[PDB]
Ligand SMILES: Nc1ncnc2c1ncn2[C@@H]1O[C@H](COP(=O)(O)OP(=O)(O)NP(=O)(O)O)[C@@H](O)[C@H]1O
Ligand SMILES: Nc1ncnc2c1ncn2[C@@H]1O[C@H](COP(=O)(O)OP(=O)(O)NP(=O)(O)O)[C@@H](O)[C@H]1O
Ligand SMILES: Cc1ncc(C[n+]2csc(CCOP(=O)(O)O)c2C)c(N)n1
Ligand SMILES: Cc1ncc(C[n+]2csc(CCOP(=O)(O)O)c2C)c(N)n1
Ligand SMILES: [K+]
Ligand SMILES: [K+]
Ligand SMILES: [K+]
Ligand SMILES: [K+]
Ligand SMILES: [K+]
Ligand SMILES: [K+]
Ligand SMILES: [Mg+2]
């Protein structure tokens with residue numbers, strides 16, 4: 163069982179209809195759907211840094227795909243295919259069975275094909291997935307575009323995964339191990355959201371990228387943050403730290419005019435949406451709690467920080 | 468200095484006019500050229516396995532791009548853009564300056580844009596580049612197209628990089644550190660070559676992928692293998708070993724009819740071309756030396772083998 167048999171045994175299932183050439187050649191081939199731009203991203207997962215060392219192989223495979231689909235969704239785009247680059251310290255059939263099952267379970271959930279990649283030996287388990295999607299030309303939702311008066315919104319709940327990481331064994335570890343990329347919501351926000359980012363590093367810092375790109379600020383209402391009932395019972399200063407600086411949420415944070423927010427609520431969405439503040443002219447991120455200014459020092463996840 | 472400053476300092480030179488959305492958002496955007504297919508590949512380099520630990524950062528950056536442009540060329544396609552996923556143990560400005568210089572030197576040599584990527588901390592230096600190209604729809608040169616009677620050809624020289632690795636300091640180390648992706652030759656072989664692969668693992672093993680995909684065999688003439696004058700002066704047995712199983716060549720091995728070969732030889736090419744054998748009906752790779760069968764056992768590079 164060497165490199166090429168590993169690819170054949172675990173990573174070479176047939177794709178959905180729309181792949182001109184999948185695994186088996188030097189590159190993969192995709193015939194573009196008409197009137198669409200290619201949307202492309204890549205994110206790396208390092209064992210022990212992006213997931214606890216004892217994470218199940220299935221959850222490693224799932225999250226390796228999910229975090230990349232999240233960046234496709236963050237543009238308003240529809241995901242199509244992925245490449246899988248994996249560096250393995252050892253060949254372990256049971257690990258490979260579960261990891262590949264996790265890859266395919268995530269791909270199949272969101273209609274994505276695995277069309278290529280690379281397999282290497284390395285001293286440390288490292289995974290880089292490239293995701294490819296398509297969007298109607300010119301309709302991508304950028305990190306720029308937020309305007310004064312726009313609502314700030316976030317999907318789902320924030321802080322779950324960060325609580326789960328420090329409370330391994332708690333049910334909220336499911337949000338650490340199995341984030342849900344908000345694929346359909348991202349598509350439903352095309353033409354409604356004025357800006358958008360996915361929350362991989364922490365709501366405050368990721369919103370900050372929108373604020374900097376859009377040259378605006380924001381005031382967030384801390385008691386509106388959508389946190390789990392478990393986090394509603396912990397002291398508020400640490401509740402805010404999980405919610406705003408925890409990261410690993412893979413929810414969508416977006417801005418939207420009040421008028422377009424009304425339109426969005428009229429849709430049938432597969433995740434909840436919460437308005438948590440609004441965009442303002444002054445170029446600072448500030449916080450308010452129960453009607454008063456709430457000074458808060460927050461730092462999201464950043465490598466080498 | 469931390470993650471986001473690193474990206475801005477080293478990996479964020481002004482984006483191509485030909486890129487709809489470059490670095491700065493959750494994904495990159497590309498507007499497809501009309502009547503062309505997307506060609507996409509990704510290859511990982513692990514420090515100490517894909518290059519000597521002491522390899523200069525500039526050479527590491529160059530080769531990270533080059534090996535991926537090679538897989539675009541192996542399809543007959545024109546390279547367009549890359550993503551860069553790098554995992555670093557430490558922040559070293561002198562290393563990052565050289566490495567990013569090598570990334571951009573290779574991109575600029577071949578007209579390619581760096582449009583996105585990912586930056587992580589990890590315990591071991593690991594790089595995965597994704598390359599994107601475009602090709603006239605339907606015209607990709609596949610590993611499965613070889614036909615009985617086709618010539619087997621290879622560009623440049625084979626065995627240089629493998630000798631270089633075993634003789635660090637020798638001028639042939641430059642073929643290990645700075646392989647040349649054969650981009651223009653790949654484009655010139657669109658519509659002429661019946662099959663093609665780039666020689667990353669070893670000519671015999673990589674030719675073997677074509678033979679299996681095409682359900683054919685090949686007979687190669689050992690004294691026609693294009694090797695460096697340095698290898699012409701070493702013992703024959705080791706010469707064949709370097710040439711046929713050395714790997715790291717990043718030359719193009721292709722099959723072509725005699726008639727299309729004559730057309731190819733009338734073109735202005737930036738690399739030499741050698742006919743080294745021919746495709747036969749029996750599904751075996753055999754070798755001939757001085758007009759007699761030459762039994763030979765070689766194995767190319769394969770992880771975990
Ligand atoms: N883990 C993986 N998952 C899915 N596809 C893969 C994976 N590893 C490799 N592939 C595909 O399997 C085929 C063979 O891969 P590979 O041997 O890496 O090709 P190559 O890049 O041309 N050679 P090399 O440069 O030596 O790695 C290609 O079509 C790859 O895209
Ligand atoms: N080494 C790199 N080379 C080129 N572009 C890069 C590199 N690292 C990151 N980028 C780009 O820089 C921007 C910020 O990257 P990044 O923070 O990784 O985005 P993200 O994936 O949305 N967040 P995260 O999931 O936390 O990594 C994106 O446009 C990336 O494509
Ligand atoms: C063992 C362990 N320690 C810490 C974390 C938290 N974590 C790791 S990377 C990251 C941001 C996204 O990464 P990137 O920016 O590299 O895409 C976060 C919040 C974890 N999940 N597991
Ligand atoms: C230090 C050192 N040891 C060995 C080699 C040789 N080598 C490494 S990977 C590979 C095949 C291509 O890799 P992959 O199949 O992963 O793309 C070859 C020929 C080297 N260059 N440096
Ligand atoms: K490849
Ligand atoms: K490989
Ligand atoms: K976005
Ligand atoms: K990304
Ligand atoms: K990152
Ligand atoms: K090919
Ligand atoms: Mg190849």
Ligand SMILES: [Mg+2]
Nearest residue numbers: 205229233362
């Ligand atoms: Mg991401």
Ligand SMILES: [Mg+2]
Nearest residue numbers: 279280281510
């Ligand atoms: Mg490869």
Ligand SMILES: [Mg+2]
Nearest residue numbers: 362363463464
């Ligand atoms: Mg991050």
Ligand SMILES: [Mg+2]
Nearest residue numbers: 233236360493
């Ligand atoms: Mg993102």
Ligand SMILES: [Mg+2]
Nearest residue numbers: 510534538667
């Ligand atoms: Mg390759």
Ligand SMILES: [Mg+2]
Nearest residue numbers: 204205584585
């Ligand atoms: Mg990233």
Ligand SMILES: [Mg+2]
Nearest residue numbers: 667668768769
């Ligand atoms: Mg190989």
